[PDB]
Design a protein around this ligand. Sequence first.
Ligand code: A1BCU
Ligand code: A1BCU
Lengths: 245, 457, 456, 245
Amino acid sequence: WSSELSKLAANAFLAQRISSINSISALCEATGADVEEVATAIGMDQRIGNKFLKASVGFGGSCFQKDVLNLVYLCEALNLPEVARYWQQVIDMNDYQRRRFASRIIDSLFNTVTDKKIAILGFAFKKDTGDTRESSSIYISKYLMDEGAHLHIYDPKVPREQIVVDLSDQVSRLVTISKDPYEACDGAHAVVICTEWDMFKELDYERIHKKMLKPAFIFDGRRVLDGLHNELQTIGFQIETIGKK
Amino acid sequence: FEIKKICCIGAGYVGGPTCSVIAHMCPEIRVTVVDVNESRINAWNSPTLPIYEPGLKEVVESCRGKNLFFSTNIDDAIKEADLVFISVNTPTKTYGMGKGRAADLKYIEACARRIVQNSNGYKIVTEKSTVPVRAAESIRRIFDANTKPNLNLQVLSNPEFLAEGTAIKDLKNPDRVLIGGDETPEGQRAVQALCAVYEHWVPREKILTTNTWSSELSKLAANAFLAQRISSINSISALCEATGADVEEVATAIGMDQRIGNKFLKASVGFGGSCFQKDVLNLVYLCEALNLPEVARYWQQVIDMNDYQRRRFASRIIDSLFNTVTDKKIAILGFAFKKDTGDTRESSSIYISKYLMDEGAHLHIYDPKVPREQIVVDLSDQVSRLVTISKDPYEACDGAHAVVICTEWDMFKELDYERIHKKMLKPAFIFDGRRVLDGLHNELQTIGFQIETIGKK
Amino acid sequence: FEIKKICCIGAGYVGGPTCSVIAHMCPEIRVTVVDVNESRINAWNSPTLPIYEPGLKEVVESCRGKNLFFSTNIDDAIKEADLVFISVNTPTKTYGMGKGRAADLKYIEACARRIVQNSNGYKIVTEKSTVPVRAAESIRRIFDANTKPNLNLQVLSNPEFLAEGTAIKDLKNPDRVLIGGDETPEGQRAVQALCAVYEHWVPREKILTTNTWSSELSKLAANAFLAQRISSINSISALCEATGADVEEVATAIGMDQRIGNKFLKASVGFGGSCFQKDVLNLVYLCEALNLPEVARYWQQVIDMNDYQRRRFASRIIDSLFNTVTDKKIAILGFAFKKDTGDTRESSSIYISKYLMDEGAHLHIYDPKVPREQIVVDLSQVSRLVTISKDPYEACDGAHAVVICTEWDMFKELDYERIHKKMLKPAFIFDGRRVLDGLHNELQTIGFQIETIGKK
Amino acid sequence: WSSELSKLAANAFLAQRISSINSISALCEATGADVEEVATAIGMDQRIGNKFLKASVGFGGSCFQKDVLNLVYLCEALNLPEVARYWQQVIDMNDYQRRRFASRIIDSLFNTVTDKKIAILGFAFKKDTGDTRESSSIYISKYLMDEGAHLHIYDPKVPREQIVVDLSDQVSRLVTISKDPYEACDGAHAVVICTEWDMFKELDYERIHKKMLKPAFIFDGRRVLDGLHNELQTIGFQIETIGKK
Ligand SMILES: O=C1CO[C@H](OP(=O)(O)OP(=O)(O)OC[C@H]2O[C@@H](n3ccc(=O)[nH]c3=O)[C@H](O)[C@@H]2O)[C@H](O)[C@H]1O
Ligand SMILES: O=C1CO[C@H](OP(=O)(O)OP(=O)(O)OC[C@H]2O[C@@H](n3ccc(=O)[nH]c3=O)[C@H](O)[C@@H]2O)[C@H](O)[C@H]1O
């Protein structure tokens, strides 16, 4: 039991680190601070550590949410409701972060995305995997699909059939799986980066902007385009990223 | 800058009549109304206009083919225009954020993109609607993001205050004209150019100029104030019914206060139209986005009261008929949302009809101007079984248990109610939701009707 | 029937001015205003009237002692009257059913019983108030149950539409006169008699006659419609401050619609007065009693919005002072619920003051007409935190903020350069009435931070 | 246990009969029927029986409310919440009956009883006892005291000191204990009969009316003045009784 509880707790502590910094990212957006700068100051405390302080659209994977959900469930079964609602906030914050990002996209596109093309760059739950389990891209995609958006989804490693399954009628009408990222962005109103694949930092954003509809939005849900902000603004993109506004 | 050619995208209740009057008052300006809807444009070019507005036919026929034109060629109309009106529909969102509350700007945005694509040089682009909801701000962003060399588009807000059924009189003698534009030299140059158009027939002192947001918020607020006047008097009508007073007498006493005024104090089954509910819903939605929940719930009461008014009216009908109306014939006199229009959008007749259809009633609906096919659509198996559209009001009442007057058409007070009573089933009810059969109450009671009206018991 | 002698029980803001104007306009009618409050009656008989109403002193002094009399002898005034007005106060019930919501009819009933005791023959008894809540019905119930041989009391409803501060002009040129009486020959004879009084100066076409309940309901509704306009424009003022618009410009555009009208569209810290909140509260309470909860919650929003408007102004002041105002001096300019009156009943200044006192502020309150002792009573912590200033420069001397709560014309003419010199910095002006509009540039140049309702 | 459960149930069945007929009394008042006539028709069914069908201001005594409360509590402890709520209605209806009667008194007196004299005739929980435990007269008295009424209470058998105890500063200001019923009614606005003492049928109501304030109300919470309604109305009383209106 101590072995299992230790695993259950360690995963939940990690997921907390993400929800805590994601919560600060929302406060940063609301007050003119930059979550990456705040995270750096936080992480230099050796008692906190500097890992797992990368604000994001939200953590995914088959571990963290499942782990916290089971921790909450175990506590509820043990009549520890105070403990249950403590850890539940880790999930609620992750869900809020995804929802907040999705509605920021919708808000920027004039409160309406029906029949608008939107490129989704990144579908795996993190870079360097084909795993999509609990990927934030699924939730962001579903929020945009529920708003009538036509998604063009590119991921360098997730298989096409997996993406259709993850997003499943409505998938047939609204979801396209692209072979390359330039095809996903061709004629798009907005590009939403959901997974921090290194190849996204190196895309030809000059070429992408030319063939996008204007105003051309990039929604960087992973902070992967930091330092390109100047170059991207000069190209003419309106860049919105988590934890900065 | 002098506006000599006007293009209006949208040949509806706003765009059509507004541009027809401009052409009428500005003989030296060429006014071309365009629309994607070919059958609507064809009707504007025909002896039977696509909407019913008193005096509109006379105005259109004095101008059409001289300086007033109707065309489906949107692109070429834009290309030659000095001023482009955008008077398209903004339906309520049916899904997503603001489903059934926020309006859908997708047509405004599509028009803005089409204007830039088809424009060179200097043009003024003016959003004109009864409920402008961030319309000018959206057009501005598309434009700011889609520049061309030597393309110089100015965005104005110019809300339309006309009410349907009195559109022509309202357009020829507006209480005020409201124009919003940027507080820049170019914005003010654009504002003045549009003012110069209206100054052909509107005194300068009745033209208000402001910035674009203040123009749209004034319209949103003005619409909401009017809708409130109705919900307030309708709420008093419920109090009158409960206490033995007469809302029409109470309204007279209220309206003699010059600080309140005596207009828009006519209690009714409930306000309808494409403006008021949409306007308040969008105001509530706007206040929730700005974290003003107290303001949101303040204005929500205007809608809640209107919905209650309709429900209370319907349940009075059902109660009067012993709580069972299955297979009972009921005449619905009036389907338009007000008199002197064929427009049925958000008409209380729809809601009253639907409440009775849910009780299994056989409705026979007569309206002098709403097209039959429109009534069928508004009420849409159940419509096929339960709804009949009558070609005259005596056919609708023949064998009816009850006559429900939902629209204050003047012809309804002139009906031969002795003849109507003879062929109705007894007890024969008249439910007046427009307080129009007033002064006929003694006659109707002598004939043998049970008369029920809003705000009087 | 000809009314030659009028008695008015109640020498307040309604009874005093109304009867003074009647006497002024009807030199052949003897009008006696009576009251249990001897000091109030003494003031009416003095060079310093007990209420401040523009033009009232001139009206009173032209008639008093000729056909206008003020007396504490209620019983004898009733005995000789052809017409008895009842113009007493109806406080909100402080306990029981309708605590804080329902009007307390205890004084109307006591007046009705006293009238029966002291009456013989025929008299017209007319309830006159700004917020009549079943008043005529309760009087009639007493009269029906307390008959005497040859005693014939008729009950009319005659709501009073005057607004304080413009009472005299309103009474001499009313938009309409509303009289309710029974729909019987006796009731109609009484209605006509009262009409004949008003017809000395009011055209007949401006006199509405109806039954007693419709008369009272019309007043309840008319007051609520007015209060709703204020809450509506105040709600828009919050939306304006949140979106960069100016409620005064929006109000102008709205008010040019002749179906809306341009009156009562002045956004403010919130409406006050003994009428509006009481009226809406009683309307809500009435609707709940009639099982009209939808109507009740509709009108409740008028009060809820007014309360929020006050709370939002107070929190703007506290926020501007960086959320600590403990021991900070704040000038309150204006304590009356509107200009040109000394009346403070339900004044927003009370509520704003109390919010600041709850933050530990040291309030220095100046009002040109509200008596100092009234301000102390209204705010009763008062000893520790509240000072009543003799002039506005004393109130602002060393203040962090100046809060204008009442639109007294003198406030826009103050020497604001002098005021700024002696204030602590940053020096804020919080204009809760839009009275400093057009001075905004000058005040900013002087160095003030100006905050006003409906603008940011 | 079966003995104790049998007692708990029998009391609760009796208290239910009262709440059931009291509930019908409210319907009778609202629809123009007479609960006494309806009760007669009901009680002639030999399966219902004709006892304990006397509508009233509400049942009192140390048994019924305590019994139903304990039955409800027992059911809650046994995890029988459906049974608990079912029997709770017996108490809720009794409380509503008292409130409805009290507010009818206040309503008839123009919504205000401050400084008004109300005679309370009957304080025992039923006739022919000095017992006041859970007497409805206590609750009615407290409702009127909370509205500022000056109560003058007469009961032929309840000791003066018990009434003071049952109603307990506010008692000192508002409560008078009268030595005879004519003293209690002297100058009263209303007479509230809460206990069905047979002597209340035999009072000189002509004499009482002469000295009462007008309009003079009698609130018969026990139906003890039935058949005197014509004479009392001729004398000039406004008579309000439970289950008729
Ligand atoms: O800008 C603008 C666009 O919106 C509106 O025009 P509308 O064409 O909707 O017509 P309307 O006269 O207000 O009638 C609205 C509904 O209220 C109902 N209505 C109207 C007046 C009344 O007193 N009682 C009542 O029930 C009508 O019977 C109808 O159902 C603005 O008035 C206009 O200034
Ligand atoms: O019958 C009657 C008795 O009740 C009322 O008279 P009042 O003496 O209460 O004066 P008032 O002019 O309405 O002002 C009320 C409050 O609203 C505030 N107020 C008034 C107008 C405005 O536009 N904005 C605003 O905030 C005032 O600043 C004040 O705080 C009826 O108007 C009268 O017809």
